Amino acid sequence: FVIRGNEVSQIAPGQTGNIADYNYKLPDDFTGCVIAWNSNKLDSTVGGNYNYRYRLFRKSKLKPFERDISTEIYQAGNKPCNGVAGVNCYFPLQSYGFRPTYGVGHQPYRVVVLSFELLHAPATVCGPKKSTNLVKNKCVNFNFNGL
Amino acid sequence: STIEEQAKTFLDKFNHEAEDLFYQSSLASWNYNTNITEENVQNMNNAGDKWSAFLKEQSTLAQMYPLQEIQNLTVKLQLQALQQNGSSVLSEDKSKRLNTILNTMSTIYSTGKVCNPDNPQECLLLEPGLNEIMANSLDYNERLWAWESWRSEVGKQLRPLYEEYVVLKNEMARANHYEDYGDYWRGDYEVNGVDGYDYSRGQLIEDVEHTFEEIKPLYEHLHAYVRAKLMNAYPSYISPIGCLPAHLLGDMWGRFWTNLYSLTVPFGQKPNIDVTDAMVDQAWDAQRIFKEAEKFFVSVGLPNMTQGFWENSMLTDPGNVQKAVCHPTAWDLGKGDFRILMCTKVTMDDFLTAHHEMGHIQYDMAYAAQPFLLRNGANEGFHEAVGEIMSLSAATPKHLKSIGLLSPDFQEDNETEINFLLKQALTIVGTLPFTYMLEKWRWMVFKGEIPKDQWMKKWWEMKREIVGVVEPVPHDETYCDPASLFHVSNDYSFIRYYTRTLYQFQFQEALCQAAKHEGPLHKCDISNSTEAGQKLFNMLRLGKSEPWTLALENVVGAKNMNVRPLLNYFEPLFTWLKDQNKNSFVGWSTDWSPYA
């Protein structure tokens, strides 16, 4: 998916930030890689990417492998502000607002979490972008997808 | 199908990139005032200066061409302003190394961790905000010694870094002709590589004896009077012999001496002359309510069109309930949202900055659909007219006093009147040598060939007066940190207001003899001058292609001869301000002046 560039500086062990605290909980033993680069010509539109929206704060932190399938009304105050952005109350939903010529510090930065997941089934997925050539009629050592 | 069309498309792309980067600076501040986080400061250190690298591309096509002599005056001025020579001598690897060093040292300097509510006075002086509130304590000894100890412990270990920076510059700094960074915005001020309106070698070698010795007695009397006021009007808590406190200057430079009028009141607890009722009650700005209330009966009958109540929507708490550490980054996208990004504190420098920002955004509501080339004005005269004029017009307290919205508790004595007169007298030729000496100082220091044999004559006062660093003997050169201060990033040199020392005088002659309201010539009245500062908006859109203010050359007179009538016009006031104090010696300037 895509995030704001500044949130890259926010995701850190023991640090604050929107993604770390209110959007995704970092696993204590996370294994994987995050690959990101400027998606100015890919994740942004000339007409304005106003479709994307986010939530500033949530009552409960999202657990790992949990998807927030709820967008209920939020009342941050002790009185019924009825969604009016005012005293002690905030509007839960805000816009992302991505444009092609964004600065690097806040570009639509890519996020590719390749979370290695151990379910109750043997391995069936691989990423073998290393397959070399093959020679014949010579005593060599060979490997075919595990064998 | 032609290279010209592709170049125009690339220029439009660059303009769009600049607009989107300004929108980024606005939106990041919006988000970080909508959320409790500070990490955006990191983006200030790395991303910002990175954009400068892109500017290099323009230089690659801006030097060899003889295109500097465009026939059109406005186009020629714009090209002179936006295509200065710059520092294009560095190679790609050298530029990368310099950028990495700059980023590392800026990160080290700007990440000062010691700024917290529990700290009595020692916070990060680089970032204003609450720092000017808790530090308002009578412990001047602590305020000085803790500050000097912190400066020592953060600067003594940096000496090898500054030495390597100096020796890296010195291999080619003798021919770089780089004096002030502010030219990044106003490169038309100084011309590099060829003679111009500035002081060349032939002009400088002559001005060091005629103008220097002509203005030396005036500067001597001025700073002698300043010293007398500082060691006599203020209590003698410390010996005048010791270094002067740098906290009196207010900001890091201290160029804006008028700030002394803001900080002339030692107290900060009891209410002052400001609209703070909403800040105490609702913790938000109250000037918008006054602006709304001062418009319902000021109609002109049949206006051409209305542009005063576009934003009729009612908004309460347009941001954070409690203000975090303030930082000046005021900028609004407009037409879909408007939020106040700048804070509000007790400083007239902030007032003048915010007035200019408000004028520029008022330009923006009309020029958001215009290219960046004509988005901002070229001459500083336009900014001066739409800038400090409004602040001076609104500085009159009669309008607020007559209504009587607040408690009738008001105090005014002879001291306030004398301070006002002194502040007015600080906006005349008297301020000129102080800034001219700083400019000449900054121009010579970046050469490396001036002999360093003598230091007591014209260098003993640099460490004692400007920085106030306490040393046994100020016989050193490696300590020149303020010459490379962080503001090089934002180019906040105040030379753009230089003409305010002269032009604003002439405007006074236009009114002080015409309106002649009740009151002698000693105190000229400027009341009800806001209409004069507002009537210019009626045709700014129409006069975009024919800027009349650019044509006249009234900014400068004639340096080739001495104008006798323009030198003794205000002699009775000048002599009164000169020989009023009894401690000023009359006649020849003695070689040894311990009290000067």
From Swiss-Prot, chain A:
Changing residue 94 to Y: Reduced host ACE2-binding affinity in vitro. Residues 1-142 are annotated as: Receptor-binding domain (RBD). It comes from the Viruses. Residues 4-6 are annotated as: Integrin-binding motif. Residues 49-57 are annotated as: Immunodominant HLA epitope recognized by the CD8+. Changing residue 84 to A: Increased resistance to neutralizing antibodies. Changing residue 91 to S: In strain: Lambda/C.37, Omicron/BQ.1.1, Omicron/XBB.1.5, Omicron/EG.5.1. Residues 56-91, 120-142 are annotated as: Disordered. Changing residue 54 to F: Decreased HLA binding to NF9 epitope. Increased binding affinity to human ACE2. Disulfide bonds join 81-89. Attaches the virion to the cell membrane by interacting with host receptor, initiating the infection. The major receptor is host ACE2. When S2/S2' has been cleaved, binding to the receptor triggers direct fusion at the cell membrane. When S2/S2' has not been cleaved, binding to the receptor results in internalization of the virus by endocytosis using host TFRC and GRM2 and leading to fusion of the virion membrane with the host endosomal membrane. Alternatively, may use NRP1/NRP2 and integrin as entry receptors. Binds to host ACE2. RBD also interacts with the N-linked glycan on 'Asn-90' of ACE2. Cleavage of S generates a polybasic C-terminal sequence on S1 that binds to host Neuropilin-1 (NRP1) and Neuropilin-2 (NRP2) receptors. Interacts with host integrin alpha-5/beta-1 (ITGA5:ITGB1) and with ACE2 in complex with integrin alpha-5/beta-1 (ITGA5:ITGB1). May interact via cytoplasmic c-terminus with M protein. May interact (via N-terminus) with host bilirubin and biliverdin, thereby preventing antibody binding to the SARS-CoV-2 spike NTD via an allosteric mechanism. This is Spike protein S1. It comes from Severe acute respiratory syndrome coronavirus 2. The lineage of its organism: Viruses, Riboviria, Orthornavirae, Pisuviricota, Pisoniviricetes. The gene is S. The chain holds residues 400 to 546 of 1273 of the full protein.
Curated annotation (Swiss-Prot), chain B:
Chloride binds at residues 151, 459, 463. Changing residue 487 to A: Complete loss of enzyme activity. Keywords: Carboxypeptidase, Cell membrane, Cell projection, Chloride, Cytoplasm, Disulfide bond, Glycoprotein, Host cell receptor for virus entry, Host-virus interaction, Hydrolase, Isopeptide bond, Membrane, Metal-binding, Metalloprotease, Phosphoprotein, Protease, Receptor, Secreted, Signal, Transmembrane, Transmembrane helix, Ubl conjugation, Zinc. Residues 1-589 form the Peptidase M2 domain. Binds 1 zinc ion per subunit. Binds 1 Cl(-) ion per subunit. An engeneered stable, dimeric and secreted receptor with combined mutations that increase the affinity for human coronavirus SARS-CoV-2 spike protein shows potent SARS-CoV and SARS-CoV-2 neutralization in vitro. Changing residue 23 to R: Increases slightly the interaction with RBD domain of SARS-CoV-2 spike protein. Changing residue 24 to L: Increases slightly the interaction with RBD domain of SARS-CoV-2 spike protein. Zn(2+) binds at residues 356, 360, 384. Expressed in endothelial cells from small and large arteries, and in arterial smooth muscle cells (at protein level). Expressed in enterocytes of the small intestine, Leydig cells and Sertoli cells (at protein level). Expressed in the renal proximal tubule and the small intestine (at protein level). Expressed in heart, kidney, testis, and gastrointestinal system (at protein level). In lung, expressed at low levels in some alveolar type 2 cells, the expression seems to be individual-specific (at protein level). Expressed in nasal epithelial cells (at protein level). Induction: Up-regulated in failing heart. Expression is induced by IFNA and IFNG. Exposure to cigarette smoke increases expression in lungs. Expression is decreased in nasal and bronchial epithelium of individuals with allergy after allergen challenge. IL13 stimulation decreases expression in nasal and bronchial epithelium. (Microbial infection) In airway epithelial cells, expression is increased upon influenza A virus infection. Changing residue 15 to D: Increases slightly the interaction with RBD domain of SARS-CoV-2 spike protein. It comes from the Eukaryota. Changing residue 19 to A: No effect on interaction with SARS-CoV spike glycoprotein. Glycans are attached at residues 35, 72, 85, 304, 414, 528. It is found in: Cell membrane; Cytoplasm; Cell projection, Cilium; Apical cell membrane. Changing residue 291 to D: No effect on interaction with SARS-CoV spike glycoprotein. Residues 12-23, 64-66, 335-339 are annotated as: Interaction with SARS-CoV spike glycoprotein. Changing residue 6 to T: Increases slightly the interaction with RBD domain of SARS-CoV-2 spike protein. The extracellular region of the ACE2 enzyme is composed of two domains. The first is a zinc metallopeptidase domain (residues 19-611). The second domain is located at the C-terminus (residues 612-740) and is 48% identical to human collectrin. This is Angiotensin-converting enzyme 2.
